[PDB]
Recover the amino acids of this structure.
């Protein structure tokens, strides 16, 4: 009559316990999951997940739903991924590196500079 | 750096990109799921 | 070279020593906040590793 649901994100847990029914917005349409549901992996739309224990509702920005007859895992995302947002962040990171580097410089100095700082860092302790 | 203990920080390099009787009910195509999950995995390792 | 100039230097260095002693405990406090954040993000990564293993195997 109940399964172990765990709603988690790359940063922290969102929910963990025992549930009666899990309602999710899959990439192809709404779902209603209950104990013993067959194994199922699915991509989630940005929207609210409704759980039955009493009733709970949590807003998620998308993710992956993994189901097994004795376990339900929701791998949520902290932000809403998308082709424009996904590409913008890459262009800003590239732009940052263009502005940072002007030209090449002496690279053989690495070893000498590292030895200088390795000797200097010992005297301090 | 990796946290060995409160008194020891270890500098490290970790490889990111180059990594039983039943099957899942894949709603979307399996390529789309694997392509998306490998990206989420690498980002999570960088965040950790 | 002069007792009073020396007395002023001692008070200056003593004022600095009091805050570096406090900053050590502040760093320990923030270390514990970072350690709890390290543990909170593990379940998501291990589960994504467990799925990719089958969806490829």
């Amino acid at each position: 009559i109940t399964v172990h649901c765990d709603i988690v994100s790359a940063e922290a847990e969102i929910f963990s316990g025992l549930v009666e029914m899990v309602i999710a917005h899959g990439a192809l349409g709404d779902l209603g999951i209950a104990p013993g549901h067959a194994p199922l992996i699915t991509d989630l739309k940005p929207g609210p997940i409704r759980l039955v224990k009493e009733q709970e509702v949590y807003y998620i920005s998308g993710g992956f739903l993994e189901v097994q007859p004795n376990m339900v895992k929701v791998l949520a995302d902290t932000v809403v991924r998308a082709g424009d947002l996904d590409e913008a962040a890459a262009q800003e990171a590239l732009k940052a590196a263009e502005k940072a580097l002007q030209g090449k410089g002496a690279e053989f100095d690495y070893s000498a500079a590292a030895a200088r700082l390795a000797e200097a860092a010992a005297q301090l302790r | 750096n990796k946290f060995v203990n409160t008194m020891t920080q270890k500098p490290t390099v970790e490889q990111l990109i180059p990594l039983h009787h039943w099957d899942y009910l894949y709603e979307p195509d399996a390529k789309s799921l694997l392509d998306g999950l490998l990206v989420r995995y690498v980002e999570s390792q960088v965040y950790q | 070279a002069g007792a009073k100039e020396i007395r002023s230097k001692i008070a200056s260095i003593k004022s600095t020593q009091k805050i570096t002693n406090a900053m050590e405990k502040v760093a320990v406090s923030k270390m514990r906040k970072a350690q709890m954040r390290m543990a909170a993000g593990r379940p998501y990564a291990e589960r994504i590793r467990q799925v990719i293993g089958h969806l490829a195997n």
Chain A has two helices and nine strands. The two ends of chain A are 62 Å apart (CA to CA).
